[PDB]
């Protein structure tokens, strides 16, 4: 008994904050008096094809049930300026919603989207009440309480004027130039600089005014998680070579007026977040440690010395932690534990559940998880997780699917929540959840990440190191008699997608592949990016001025390598990215290789519509079952699909 984890289960697991939340992601808020925590829960429904967002308030003593103080809103895309463009096309990730408590602890203020416009809403924390509150010609980008009746908010109306100006310029046609990014649309994009504007709303009158410079500086300033004060000691973090972006940082203590003192313990290196507590005479800090930085660890350090002692450590992630007296309230995530709310006892180590918006996942028949560790041929430590089917007996050689994850925590879908780790194991695959190790270049001295990127791309050195690491991991599971090395699938999104294309060209390790985007070639990196991004990628080592048949692009281009590429490839692409795939896809078809391209409408680099996500999950499982198990699902609504694939398999004669 006990039900299995299926794609239908997976896509419905609720989540908190942006998909790729890490230690400083502000996904939760403590009330001023620390008795309540506020956080948004997101739950995807593949049947309605909508996400259900709720604003939640739970009491930190865990005595009362949580309360939905708001329900509803559309998926709000997280957006940043990025290439000198003011607002790029959405990556597809949801904005983390940070609820803002009123000074009284009475209301929350938070951004919410309806009818494609982002507003400020206010909510009774219990006495329940919906109601939008601030609305403008532009989306509200941020909001704070100045007092219990006054709100300050930010946004960019000059962005909306610039769009209106682009519309006017079109009457005579636009010059194709720096403003264009063809892959994502046929209109000029707004260029930076676009100013941010701060206004304040009186909730008693309904009046807006400008914000005073003092009020601006209170909204525009953000707390530093790598600085803390305890009495007269200022704690901070620094390097002995401050311009080397890869030099490790050390905790530093500035005692009153005196010179900064550096901490000597190895535990003091590479802190990611610190908290000062003046009641206890203590600094607390968070960091990553262990083999290949695979674990989280929390340290407690009596503030009058520099001798931190570890009080908690685990695999997984802790996110958005805030201190209430002797407690840290955190979001926490782990291989078999989706993101939940938790309490950490700041004197003992003890972690305790606070809020889990999903059932206990242990009520399902869960795959078995094991962490793999090795050192690769460059001498660099590597970790990854091996996921095995629930009823697995050592002695059965399994087909293997490789899912790439650029973050940590719950075994969900890898980097874009795109490849269903636990459902695949339920279907009988071994699954490698692969965490690419540090590059060689990252141990050397660089003053700029752009120059580091360039050295990583030189002769695809880091790509080779990534591929060799994958091969080391496969070999390890082959020695254990766990996998069949002739039945290894590879999947990937974002950086994982480039590793897929490189891996299919430069080895024979893979018998099938899935990717969410195509084509590491000059067409995609140069033509479809438009001349601005194309010109700028050059400094990162992307040779956008070189031809596809040159030494750089020959390592990855499917146009150039079409006739040697015998790994079956499925491309499940957002419509916003499919243009880049057409030449490579056409070359593979022309060459009679087994390719298939799927196009999802109104999608982004990361996919956001639950029905799309569920169909990706299912097609990818069907794909690998077919190529790596020679199995098909007899379901009638799949009959056209398996005729398509049987014909692709017949091309191999």
97 closest CA partner among 65, 120, 115: 120
Helix (H, G, I), strand (E, B) or coil at 303: coil
The C-alpha atoms of residue 190 and residue 289 are separated, in whole angstroms, by 42
What the block records as the tokens of 133 is 């509150």
Three-state secondary-structure class, residue 508: coil
Q: What are phi and psi of 83, to 5 degrees?
A: -120, 30
Q: Are 339 and 39 in contact (CB under 8 A)?
A: no
Task: Read off the tokens for 548.
Answer: 């596809």
Q: Is 63 exposed, middle or buried (0-12, 13-18, 19+ CB in 10 A)?
A: exposed
Q: Which of 403, 396, 420 is nearest to 622 (CA)?
A: 420
Instruction: Tally the domains of the chain.
Output: 3
Residue for token pair 């438009």: 530
Distance separating alpha carbons of residues 529 and 538, to the nearest angstrom: 12
Looking at 333, 577, 596, 603, which residue is catalytic?
A: 577
Give the burial class of 360: count Cβ atoms within 10 A of its Cβ; 0-12 exposed, 13-18 middle, 19 or more buried. Answer: exposed
CB 453 within 8 A of CB 397: no
Q: What count of Cα atoms within 13 Å lies in the side-chain half-sphere of residue 130?
A: 6
Contact call for residues 148 and 106 (beta carbons, < 8 A): yes
Q: What secondary structure, in 3-state letters, does 48-62 show?
A: CCEEEEEEEEEECCC
Residues 440 and 561 occupy one common structural domain:
yes
Reply yes or no on whether 221 is catalytic.
no
- As a whole number of angstroms, the distance between CA 387 and CA 424 comes to 9
In angstroms, the CA 133 to CA 123 distance is 10
Rounded Cα distance, 519 and 500, in Å: 10
- Strands laid side by side in the 327-334 sheet: 317-324, 327-334, 337-345, 351-355
Strands 50-59 and 36-45, how do they pair? antiparallel
CATH classification of the domain holding 286? 2.130.10.120
Classify burial at 499, counting beta carbons within 10 Å of its beta carbon; exposed 0-12, middle 13-18, buried 19 or more. buried
Is residue 253 domain-shared with residue 173, that is, in the same domain?
no
SS3 state of residue 255: strand
Is 525 within 8 Å of 537 (Cβ atoms)? yes
SS3 annotation, 197-254:
EEEEEECCCCCEEECCHHHHHHHHCCCCCCCEEECCEEEEEECCCCCCCCCCCEEEEE
**Residue 555 in 3-state DSSP?**
helix
Statement to judge: residues 122 and 269 lie in one domain = no
C-alpha to C-alpha distance for 532 and 108, rounded to whole angstroms: 42
501-539: string of b/e by CB count within 10 Å (b at 16+)? Answer: bbbbbeeebbbbbbbbbbbbbbbbbbbbbbbbbbeebbe
- Phi, psi for 199 (deg, rounded to 5): -125, 155
Residue 443 covered by a domain: yes
Question: Do 196 and 279 have their domain in common?
Answer: no
Q: Report the distance separating Cα 271 and Cα 263, nearest Å.
A: 12
C-beta of residue 651 within 8 angstroms of C-beta of residue 594: yes
At 400, which helix (H) or strand (E)?
strand 398-404
Instruction: Say yes or no: 145 and 276 in one domain.
Output: no
| Residue linked to tokens 């203020």 | 109
Q: Is residue 347 part of a domain?
A: yes
Q: In whole angstroms, what is the distance from residue 112 CA to residue 482 CA?
A: 48
Q: Which residues pair with 50 in a beta bridge?
A: 45
Instruction: Tell me if residue 605 is catalytic.
Output: yes
List of E strands, 435-527: 483-492, 512-515
Among residues 167, 201, 223, the one where a domain terminates is 223
Domain that holds residue 215: 25-223
8 Å CB contact between 420 and 413: yes
Tell me how far apart the alpha carbons of residues 430 and 225 are, in angstroms, rounded to a whole number.
39
The three-state secondary structure class of 387 is strand
Q: How far apart are CA 6 and CA 4, in angstroms?
A: 6
3-state secondary structure of 474: helix
CA–CA gap between residue 629 and residue 622 (Å, rounded): 10
- Domain's final residue, options 172, 204, 223: 223
What's the Cα-to-Cα distance from 651 to each of 106, 417, 646, rounded to whole Å? 67, 32, 9
Experimental method: X-ray
CB atoms within 10 A of CB 193: 8
In a domain, 47, yes or no: yes
Reported for 543-548, long-range contacts at CB under 8 A and 24+ positions apart, including other chains, are 546/522, 547/522, 548/521, 548/522, 548/523
- The residues that bridge with 252 in the sheet, in sequence order, are 236, 262
Active site residue 124: no
Do residues 377 and 438 share a domain? yes
Closest by Cα among 125, 110, 130 to 67: 125
Is 16 within a domain? no
3-state secondary structure of 443: helix
Residues 6+ away with beta carbon under 8 Å from 227: 234, 235, 236, 237, 274
End-to-end CA separation in angstroms for the chain: 44
HSE at residue 187, side-chain half, CA atoms within 13 A, is 15
**Residue 20 falls within a domain, yes or no?**
no
Q: Distance between CA 571 and CA 581 in Å, rounded?
A: 9
Please state, in angstroms and rounded to a whole number, the distance separating the CA atoms of residues 298 and 343. Answer: 13
CATH number at residue 623: 3.40.50.1820
Distance, CA of 268 to CA of 289 (rounded, Å): 11
Gap between the Cα atoms of 295 and 348, Å rounded: 18
In angstroms, the CA 452 to CA 148 distance is 48
Cα 419–92–460 angle (5° rounding)? Answer: 65
Which positions ≥6 away from 12 have C-beta within 8 Å?
43, 44, 45, 46
Find the helix or strand (DSSP H, E) in which 8 lies: helix 7-12
Report which of 422, 414, 572, 402 is spatially closest to residue 491, judged by C-alpha positions.
402
- The C-alpha atoms of residue 182 and residue 535 are separated, in whole angstroms, by 14
What is d(CA 587, CA 650) in angstroms, rounded to the nearest whole number? 18
Residues linked to residue 531 through DSSP beta bridges, in sequence order: none
Does residue 342 contact residue 334 with C-beta atoms inside 8 Å? no
How far is 512 from 625, CA to CA, in rounded Å? 10
Whether 4 maps to a domain, the answer reads no
User: In angstroms, rounded to a whole number, what is the distance separating the alpha carbons of residues 138 and 131?
Assistant: 19
235 shares a domain with 200:
no
d(CA 84, CA 639): 48
What is the enclosing helix (H) or strand (E) of 112? strand 107-114
Catalytic residue among 453, 494, 526, 557: 494
Neighbouring residues of 320: CB distance < 8 A, sequence distance ≥ 6: 17, 21, 23, 24, 25, 26, 27, 28, 330, 331
Q: How many helices (H) and strands (E) does the chain have?
A: 13, 33
Quick one: 49 and 185 in the same domain?
A: yes
CB contact at 8 A, 505 and 556: yes
481 and 572, same domain (yes or no): yes
Residue 13 is assigned to a structural domain of this protein: no
What sign has the CA pseudo-torsion 395, 397, 403, 404? positive
* Integer Cα distance of 128 and 378 in angstroms: 58
Beta-carbon contacts of 319 under 8 Å, excluding residues fewer than 6 positions away, are 17, 21, 22, 23, 25, 27, 330, 331, 332, 333, 339
Peptide bond into 193 cis (omega under 30): yes
Evaluate whether residue 5 is within a structural domain.
Answer: no
Q: Is 117 exposed, middle or buried (0-12, 13-18, 19+ CB in 10 A)?
A: middle
Last residue of a domain, one of 200, 223, 246: 223
Closest by CA to 232, choosing from 201, 260, 199, 257, is 257
Same domain, 218 and 231: no
Determine the Cα–Cα distance for residues 548 and 587; give it in Å rounded to an integer: 13
Pair 520, 577: CB distance under 8 Å:
no
Query: Within this chain, do residues 191 and 287 fall inside the same structural domain, yes or no?
Result: no
Of 543, 557, 552, 634, the residue nearest 591 (C-alpha): 557
- Where are any strands of DSSP class E within 516-640? 569-574, 595-600
Same domain for 177 and 215, yes or no, is: yes
536/548 Cα distance (integer angstroms): 18
Q: How far apart, in Å, are the Cα atoms of 339 and each of 16, 29, 62, 98, 354?
A: 7, 16, 17, 16, 12
């Amino acid at each position: 008994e006990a039900p299995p984890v299926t794609p239908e289960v997976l896509v419905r697991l609720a989540d908190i904050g942006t998909m790729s939340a890490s230690e400083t992601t502000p996904l939760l808020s403590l009330s001023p008096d620390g008795r309540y925590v506020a956080f948004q829960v997101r739950q995807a429904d593949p049947v309605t094809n909508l996400n259900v967002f709720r604003m939640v308030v739970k009491a930190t003593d865990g005595a009362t049930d949580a309360i939905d103080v708001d329900v509803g809103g559309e998926y709000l895309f997280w957006t940043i300026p990025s290439w000198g463009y003011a607002r790029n096309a959405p990556s597809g990730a949801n904005l983390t919603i940070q609820p803002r408590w009123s000074p009284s602890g009475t209301h929350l203020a938070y951004l919410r989207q309806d009818q494609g416009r982002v507003r400020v809403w206010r909510a009774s924390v219990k006495g329940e009440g919906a109601s939008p509150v601030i609305e403008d010609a532009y989306d509200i980008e941020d909001v704070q309480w100045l007092d219990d009746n006054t709100l300050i908010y930010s946004g960019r109306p000059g962005f909306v004027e610039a769009e209106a100006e682009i519309e006017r310029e079109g009457r005579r046609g636009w010059v194709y130039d720096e403003r264009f990014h063809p892959l994502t649309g046929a209109r000029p994009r707004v260029l930076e600089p676009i100013s941010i504007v701060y206004q304040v709303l009186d909730l008693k009158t309904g009046t807006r005014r400008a914000a005073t410079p003092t009020e601006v500086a209170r909204l525009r300033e953000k707390p530093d998680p790598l600085r803390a004060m305890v009495g007269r000691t200022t704690f901070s973090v620094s390097r002995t070579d401050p311009q080397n972006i890869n030099a490790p940082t050390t905790l530093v203590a500035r005692r009153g007026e005196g010179e900064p003192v550096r901490c000597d313990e190895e535990a003091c290196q590479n802190i990611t977040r610190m908290w000062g507590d003046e009641t206890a005479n203590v600094l607390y800090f968070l960091r990553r440690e262990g083999w290949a930085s695979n674990e989280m660890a929390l340290y407690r350090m009596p503030a009058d010395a520099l001798k931190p002692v570890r009080i908690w450590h685990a695999t997984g992630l802790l996110q958005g932690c805030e201190r209430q007296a002797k407690r840290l309230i955190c979001a926490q995530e782990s291989a078999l534990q989706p993101r939940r709310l938790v309490t950490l006892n700041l004197t003992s180590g003890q972690m305790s559940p606070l809020y889990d918006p999903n059932p206990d996942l242990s009520r399902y028949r869960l795959p078995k998880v094991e962490r793999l560790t090795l050192r690769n041929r460059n001498g660099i430590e590597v970790f990854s997780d091996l996921v095995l089917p629930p009823d697995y007996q050592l002695g059965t050689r399994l087909p293997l699917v490789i899912v790439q994850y650029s973050s940590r925590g719950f075994l969900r879908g890898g980097t874009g929540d795109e490849n269903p780790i636990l459902p695949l194991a339920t279907a009988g695959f071994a699954v490698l959840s692969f965490h690419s190790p540090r590059s060689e270049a990252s141990y050397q001295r660089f003053t700029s990440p752009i120059a580091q990127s360039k050295a990583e791309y030189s002769n695809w050195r880091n790509r080779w190191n990534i591929l060799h690491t994958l091969e080391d991991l496969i070999d390890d599971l082959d020695r254990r008699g766990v996998i069949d090395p002739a039945r290894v699938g590879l999947t990937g999104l974002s950086d994982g997608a480039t590793t897929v294309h490189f891996g299919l060209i430069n080895s024979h390790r893979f018998a099938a592949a899935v990717t969410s985007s195509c084509c590491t070639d000059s067409f995609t990196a140069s033509v479809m990016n438009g001349p601005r991004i194309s010109g700028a990628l050059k400094a990162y080592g992307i040779e956008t001025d070189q031809a596809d048949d040159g030494p750089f692009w020959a390592a990855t281009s499917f146009v150039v390598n079409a006739s040697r590429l015998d790994t079956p490839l499925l491309i499940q692409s957002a419509d916003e990215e499919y243009l880049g795939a057409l030449p490579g896809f056409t070359a593979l078809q022309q060459a009679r290789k087994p390719v298939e391209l799927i196009i999802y409408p109104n999608e982004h680099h990361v996919k956001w519509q639950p029905a799309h996500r569920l169909a990706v999950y299912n097609r990818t499982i069907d794909w690998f079952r077919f190529w790596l198990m020679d199995q098909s699902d007899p379901a009638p609504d799949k009959a056209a699909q398996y005729d398509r694939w049987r014909a692709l398999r017949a091309l191999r004669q």
